[PDB]
Design a protein around this ligand. Structure first.
Ligand code: NA
Length: 218
């Protein structure tokens, strides 16, 4: 079938759509991330890095408890050498594959009919790329695809903490039952459901456009 927006029709009680970034808009490859951090000297990266919820200094960075520079310093101490910001950024970008422009185009089409928000565990290294014209070959920052970004490191909590969902709900004024939450992570989906959201859990790396269209018309 043809998933171009002009072919698509939308009608249901859903008014808002909340997307995660990694695992939904852009593919995550944890093995590639592990390799990228090992390159810096983090020889035990395989035990440290997670697909859904970081721990240790990685969590602290994604909750804004460590600044990018502070994280760089503490990561360097683990690696036994002083890291630059650029090589630390490049390690973080190891988590990601280039974006499927089909997904970005689909999301632009959604904005004609829905309020679209991002709610994501992320950090300044990743966002310096995503929230810039370097995000993709289309030259539009992640900001162009949403009404507002809710970023863990600016809010002090990471999903699946209920607090990050609560901030987003209160700030955006969405009614959870009229909102579709799209996230590849099970724990995040479960708390979203508990708080009243409709949920859709796509597979990381999969083309979810068809199924999303079906859900938005259910
Ligand atoms: Na995700």
């Amino acid at each position: 079938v043809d998933l171009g927006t002009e072919n698509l029709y939308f009608q249901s009680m859903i008014k808002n759509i909340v997307f995660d970034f990694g695992g939904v808009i852009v593919d995550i490859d944890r093995d590639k991330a592990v390799q990228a951090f090992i390159k810096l000297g983090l020889a035990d990266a395989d035990t440290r890095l997670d697909k859904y919820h970081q721990t240790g200094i990685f969590q602290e960075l994604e909750e804004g408890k460590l600044s990018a520079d502070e994280f760089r310093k503490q990561l360097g101490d683990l690696c036994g050498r002083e890291l630059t910001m650029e090589e630390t950024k490049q390690a973080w970008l190891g988590f990601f594959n280039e974006v499927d422009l089909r997904k970005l185009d689909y999301i632009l089409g959604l904005r004609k009919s829905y309020h679209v928000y991002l709610l994501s565990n992320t950090n300044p290294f990743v966002m310096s790329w995503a929230c810039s014209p370097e995000f993709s070959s289309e030259g539009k920052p992640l900001n162009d695809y949403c009404d507002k970004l809710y970023l863990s490191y600016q809010l002090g909590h990471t999903k699946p903490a209920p607090e990050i969902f609560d901030f987003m709900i209160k700030d955006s004024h969405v009614i959870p039952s009229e909102t579709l939450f799209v996230d590849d992570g099970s724990s995040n989906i479960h708390i979203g459901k508990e708080l009243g959201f409709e949920t859709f859990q796509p597979e990381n790396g999969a083309d979810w456009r068809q199924e999303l269209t079906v859900i938005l018309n259910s």
